[PDB]
Design a binder for this molecule. Structure first.
Ligand SMILES: CC(=O)N[C@H]1[C@@H](O[C@H]2[C@@H](O)[C@@H](CO)O[C@H](O)[C@@H]2O[C@@H]2O[C@@H](C)[C@@H](O)[C@@H](O)[C@@H]2O)O[C@H](CO)[C@H](O)[C@@H]1O
Ligand SMILES: CC(=O)N[C@H]1[C@@H](O[C@H]2[C@@H](O)[C@@H](CO)O[C@H](O)[C@@H]2O[C@@H]2O[C@@H](C)[C@@H](O)[C@@H](O)[C@@H]2O)O[C@H](CO)[C@H](O)[C@@H]1O
Ligand SMILES: [Ca+2]
Ligand SMILES: [Ca+2]
Ligand SMILES: [Ca+2]
Ligand SMILES: [Ca+2]
Lengths: 229, 229
């Protein structure tokens, strides 16, 4: 279906729903919480999602957002993702699960219905993932179907980074381009029929998790979807 | 292989190779020529190509540029493209061939080695294309393998528009995202193994053609390629 929205900042959150440990703070989406001294709280997850459902049948979409990861250590955890799931998808487990999965079914594709672009700051050995920090595309599993190295100079830049995420409903291809000012550029694509996975309604939004010594912020976000008929 | 470059504008055109009717003009790349009164000259083609070659085996790349199409009537022709080609690729035919094909082989995928993202202002009936202005991915043929409607409001906006083109060398997927400020967003993707088409050096650049009543300008441009090792 057709939907568009545009948040240059989050002084308004009229149509944003916050769950779990996410909240609106300093004109941003703050995905995980901090205590009264600004210290990230451990083992928390949260979601900030656009509140209106949409459909993926015969649809392409384009979305772009800017983000900051604030780390206070050389060993931050766990990252964040932009995701799509049914409208009643809840905040799931903290830590390496990124608010999107739970331990007993995290790598079981038949037990999940969630697609995401993850920004993964903590190398987990509890399931298969690369031995360095990475950006990936997740289809129904915490084990990414396409994954690439995220350079530490970018992870730790404290820059306002940009993501572009698009879905071509004709070719059935999800793509992310991530850019850093005077930094790295990242390109990932994967063939996935989202309308097959999601024959009804979905919502799009962000999930963040700790971990430790890391807060994830969304500074701006826009979206448009169009019929491919 | 690895290459990066950045033109925030075209005050400098070092390492741009101009061919045909393309020239530097007013800190932009002007792809087709105008007379000393600024009127678009009919039936002309022009290339503006980054001078240094790169290779596609085990490589991904990201590139972005801004552009303006100036029209002097409601019947502009023919558009422009960003393209990759082997060394010493010549300026080809003006008109609907976009500077990238010759009439006798324009639809023959066995007789061309050129990959492009085209912005097509003139509906041609001499070969198959949509009945409306369109953005397309071209693989070895003027008949686009993935093609989408380009809305006239955007064509005639006089806006500085942005294109993002990415190639994921692991999944073998070329993607374009095109955005207009306060206008349309466009998403196209295609599965193509570029290293199989281009086994040696390639160069990246722009080709523009008339036609009539149209000049195509590139205002800024950046590019990075990295190894998928
Ligand atoms: C599955 C999960 O969410 N793990 C978290 C978790 O992992 C840590 C943590 O469990 C501590 C408890 O003392 O023990 C380990 O450090 C564990 O990390 C795991 O094992 C280590 C030895 C390495 O192999 C590491 O790759 C692996 O993940 O907490 C951390 C933050 O401390 C993250 O939040 C993980 O995702
Ligand atoms: C193949 C090519 O490069 N076509 C150009 C060309 O096409 C014109 C042109 O050939 C004039 C010359 O008198 O004749 C026709 O207008 C032709 O347009 C073609 O035929 C018409 C009837 C339509 O069906 C149209 O879709 C088709 O292109 O010049 C035009 C600008 O006038 C463009 O530059 C084409 O790409
Ligand atoms: Ca991961
Ligand atoms: Ca992880
Ligand atoms: Ca065309
Ligand atoms: Ca045409």
């Amino acid at each position: 279906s057709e939907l568009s929205f545009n948040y240059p900042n989050f002084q308004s959150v009229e149509d944003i729903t916050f769950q779990g440990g996410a909240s609106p703070r300093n004109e941003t989406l703050q995905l995980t919480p901090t205590d009264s001294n600004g210290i990230p709280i451990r083992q928390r997850a949260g979601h900030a999602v656009y509140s209106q459902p949409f459909q993926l049948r015969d649809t392409s979409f384009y979305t772009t957002f800017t983000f900051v990861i604030r780390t206070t250590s050389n060993s931050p955890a766990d990252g964040f993702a932009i995701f799509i799931a049914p409208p009643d998808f809840p905040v799931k487990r903290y830590g390496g699960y990124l608010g999107l999965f739970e331990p007993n079914t995290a790598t079981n594709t038949s037990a999940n219905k969630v697609v995401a672009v993850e920004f993964d700051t903590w190398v987990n050995t509890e399931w298969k993932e690369p031995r360095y920090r990475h950006i990936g595309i997740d289809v129904n599993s915490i084990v990414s179907v396409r994954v690439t190295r995220w350079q530490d100079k970018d992870v730790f830049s404290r820059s306002i980074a940009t993501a572009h995420v698009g879905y071509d409903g004709i070719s059935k291809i999800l793509t992310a381009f991530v850019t850093y000012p005077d930094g790295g550029n990242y390109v990932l694509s994967h063939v996935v029929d989202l309308a097959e996975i999601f024959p009804g309604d979905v919502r799009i939004g962000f999930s963040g998790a700790t971990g430790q010594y890391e807060t994830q912020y969304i500074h701006s976000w826009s979206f448009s979807s169009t019929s491919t008929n």
